[PDB]
Ligand binder design. Structure first.
Ligand SMILES: CC(=O)N[C@@H]1[C@@H](O)[C@H](O[C@@H]2O[C@H](CO)[C@@H](O)[C@H](O)[C@H]2NC(C)=O)[C@@H](CO)O[C@H]1O
Length: 406
């Protein structure tokens, strides 16, 4: 016929995501108004739970939601090759969207597009300029030695230097910082070779990154309470003024600028991960990695509703509102930058544009079992439960096991 009901899986569940959810609901309402009979049932799920358990299990059963928050790289590759992702090339051409995205490479398998980035990301250090000034730092550190000097000065003032919430199942929050440490010590191509068999987690330059990560914790630069706080609590420690910096993705800018929760809005700056002097200088972790994918097991009315949702979500107006009102870097070209953008906003753009290149997050490049093994391992590493050497050996074992199976 007919009238259809589609499940829309999203991860915009936290109070710091109210903006993003409201924009999604606004898009949904517009789609329902122009497609009679089409109804969307929003299913909000925690980020780790959707990506690593719920959607993973649904896809193993071959029964994903019709619409779901999806990650580029390994996740998209697995579900595309299992045949559970709608190919989007023809929809994009029909909607005149074929040429409008900055980068679809993470969502592309054998030339076919299997999901659409909602936004871009970078990762970097948010920092409190007043807490820095209290400790004698007057500039954001550009180099690693400038960075450790800042950490020393902060610790000497009994200021918690680096907030980080890596407890419970939020090991990925530690991996954001690890992520960029081992690209800085080993270079961006090192993480590309793990899945290829051409580099190893045990390579000395990679191990060096994890040595430095542990040392940040041992010296008290990473919050001693890192394993006692969930991701969002680590975030809150920074934006309530209780620690001097925070390594996080640009989706976090909203939380940090939130009027009701942030005490630091007049005193926040940003700097890229500092230069160590190897193959990763002046690079930035970033890309277009996260957005919506669609089930391939659709009847014609489902396909019509899915096309209309894509039409109404991936539009310059919706992208510009996410940028101006939720600080989410556009995934589409041609989005004008809003008026009176906060200093923080100006700093993150300068950080992105002046980078010589971006490198993706490692979880775009390695299988899910490898990712979750690292998550568990860095929590151990920061808890006195694992040495840097034992971590890299553990990682290369699961890497070999993943490469052999695939
Ligand atoms: C469009 C957007 O900004 N989505 C955000 C997600 O990217 C982000 O998830 C994290 O993204 C990183 C970069 O792709 C991944 O390395 C990281 O593994 C991933 N974290 C998880 C738990 O999946 C989430 C974080 O809550 O926020 C989204 O809004």
């Amino acid at each position: 016929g007919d009238s259809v009901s589609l499940t829309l899986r999203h991860i915009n569940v936290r109070d710091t995501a109210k903006n993003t959810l409201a924009l999604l609901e606004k898009v949904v309402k517009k789609t329902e108004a122009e497609v009679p009979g089409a109804t969307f049932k929003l299913d909000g799920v925690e980020d780790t739970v959707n990506r690593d358990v719920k959607l993973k299990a649904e896809m193993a059963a071959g029964k994903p939601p019709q619409i779901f928050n999806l990650f580029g790289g390994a996740d998209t590759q697995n579900y595309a090759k299992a045949g559970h992702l709608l190919p989007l090339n023809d929809i994009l051409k029909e909607l005149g969207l074929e040429d409008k995205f900055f980068e679809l490479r993470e969502f592309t398998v054998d030339g076919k597009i299997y999901g659409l980035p909602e936004a871009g990301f970078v990762e970097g250090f948010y920092y409190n300029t007043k807490l820095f000034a209290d400790a004698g730092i007057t500039s954001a550190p550009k180099t690693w030695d400038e960075f450790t000097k800042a950490l020393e000065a902060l610790k000497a003032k009994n200021i918690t230097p680096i907030a980080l919430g890596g407890g419970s199942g939020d090991g990925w929050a530690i991996n954001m910082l690890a992520n960029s440490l081992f690209v800085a010590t080993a270079g961006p191509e090192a993480q590309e070779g793990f899945a290829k068999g051409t580099t190893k987690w045990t390579d000395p330059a990679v191990l060096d990154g994890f040595k430095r990560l542990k040392d940040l914790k041992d010296k008290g630069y990473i919050d001693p309470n890192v394993l006692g706080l969930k991701y969002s609590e680590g975030q809150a420690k920074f934006y309530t003024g209780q620690a001097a910096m925070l390594f996080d993705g640009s989706w976090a800018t909203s939380a940090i600028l939130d009027k009701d929760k942030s005490t630091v809005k007049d005193n926040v700056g940003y700097f890229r991960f500092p230069n160590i002097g190897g193959k990763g200088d002046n690079l930035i972790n970033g890309g277009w990695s996260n957005g919506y994918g669609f089930s391939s097991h659709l009847n014609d009315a489902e396909k019509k509703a899915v096309k209309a949702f894509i039409k109404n979500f991936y539009t310059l107006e919706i992208q510009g509102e996410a940028l101006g009102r939720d600080n989410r870097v556009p995934s589409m070209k041609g989005v004008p930058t809003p008026a009176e953008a906060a200093p923080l906003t100006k700093a993150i753009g300068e950080a992105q544009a002046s980078a010589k290149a971006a490198f993706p997050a490692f979880d775009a490049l390695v299988q899910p079992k490898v990712k979750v093994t690292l998550e568990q391992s860095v929590q151990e590493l920061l808890g006195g439960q694992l040495t840097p050497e034992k971590l890299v050996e553990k990682m290369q074992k699961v890497q070999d096991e993943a490469n052999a199976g695939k």
